[PDB]
Write a protein that binds this ligand. Structure first.
Ligand code: BXQ
Length: 375
């Protein structure tokens, strides 16, 4: 039941959102990062300084060794491991147990994060980007094949963890309309952005620039990441709007804190960002609007806690546009694999203050018939 799956996530955008799973027989409990930006299921399987616990294959009588190895390099971080299959369950997810491929991580570099509280990663994207290749069936595909749960899941990520609902839409988790954008290609969850405004002002670029060389929805990474041209235009606009404030050296590079007296953050001087996504009907679109409460990410540190401090959670990308966790936060996001579309709606934990609120609005119509896809 969906009600049983509600509030089954913990974590933050900066260190990720994770769900409890078990592997092996008897079941071994682990916390697992929910990642729509990759397609491998992998768990720590050997001691590591940052791991509270790990998968012990010798203690699972249902483990089968595939006698093959696998290596996954992400944008930052990588691991190597041994492939096998075993029984996998989600205690606070669907009421089923399935046999799935598992990469047992034996070596890693900058993959595990000190204090994150997760020990593995659940790649929910498509087989096309699985390593070593597309013949390694991803977890969700196995789940659907073996249980015939409906082929979709939804994510409600919340800031200061959320819910992952498998098998159908929980209307309790959103208000207003659910708007759908087509999945352009089933590899990453690739989508098309047709227009970008910052505080109502159109960036006026050829819309293919917004999707150079792809745009994806990626719960596994923290920031909104933009292609250089779009990134520079966005920073220009946000800097202009907030000019009454002085920001530290390096703030706009995203790795320097800015702080304000507790409760005095000047939200109003930062603009809203509107991303218009391709609609299901030709040249119609809808927008999701992103507040500074989203793209200024709070950094929790007891040492700085006399004040409220933030990092700038928009980054220049070399891999195309990435709608990461700070973008997904506050929205109910439906990964409707069965109908090859992703839906957005305002969720119960959407960001807002007394003047402005995150929103999902449409339809909008566009005159120019250009295809905004880059490939
Ligand atoms: C298909 C594949 C080859 C896997 C590939 C290669 C490059 C980029 C991508 C796109 N998705 C990527 C984007 S990323 O590298 O920023 C995060 C990874 C998953 C990931 C790997 C890691 F180490 C670590 N710490 C984390 C934790 C995150 O940093 C946090 F903390 F959640 F924000 C997450 C995504 O999956 C996919």
């Amino acid at each position: 039941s969906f009600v049983e799956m509600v509030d089954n996530l913990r974590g933050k955008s900066g260190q990720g959102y994770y769900v409890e799973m078990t592997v092996g027989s008897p079941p071994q409990t682990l916390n697992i990062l929910v990642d729509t930006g990759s397609s491998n299921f992998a768990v720590g399987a050997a001691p590591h300084p940052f791991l509270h616990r790990y998968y012990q294959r010798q203690l699972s009588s249902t483990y089968r060794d595939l006698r093959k190895g696998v290596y996954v390099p992400y944008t930052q971080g990588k691991w190597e491991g041994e492939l096998g299959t075993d029984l996998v369950s989600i205690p606070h997810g669907p009421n089923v147990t399935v046999r799935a491929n598992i990469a047992a991580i034996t070596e890693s570099d900058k993959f595990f994060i000190n204090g994150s509280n997760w020990e593995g990663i659940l790649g929910l994207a498509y087989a096309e980007i699985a390593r070593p290749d597309d013949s390694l069936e991803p977890f969700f595909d196995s789940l659907v094949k073996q249980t015939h749960v409906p082929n979709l899941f939804s994510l409600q990520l919340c800031g200061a963890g959320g819910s992952m609902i498998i098998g159908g839409i929980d209307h309790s988790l959103y208000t207003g309309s659910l708007w759908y954008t087509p999945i352009r290609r089933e590899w990453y969850y690739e989508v098309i952005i047709v227009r970008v405004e910052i505080n109502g002002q159109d960036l006026k670029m050829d819309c293919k620039e917004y999707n150079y060389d792809k745009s994806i929805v990626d719960s596994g990474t923290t920031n909104l990441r933009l292609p250089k041209k779009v990134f520079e235009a966005a920073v220009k606009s946000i800097k202009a709007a907030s000019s009454t404030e002085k920001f530290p050296d390096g703030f706009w590079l995203g790795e320097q804190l800015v702080c304000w007296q507790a409760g005095t953050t000047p939200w109003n001087i930062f603009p809203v960002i509107s991303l218009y996504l391709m609609g299901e009907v030709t040249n119609q679109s809808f927008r999701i609007t992103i507040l500074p409460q989203q793209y200024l990410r709070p950094v929790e540190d007891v040492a700085t806690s006399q004040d409220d401090c933030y990092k700038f959670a928009i980054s220049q990308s070399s891999t195309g546009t990435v709608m990461g966790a700070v973008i997904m936060e506050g929205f109910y996001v439906v990964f409707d694999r069965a109908r090859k579309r992703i839906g957005f709606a305002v969720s119960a934990c959407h960001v807002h203050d007394e003047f402005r609120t995150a929103a999902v609005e449409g339809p909008f119509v566009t005159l120019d018939m250009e295809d905004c896809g880059y490939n």
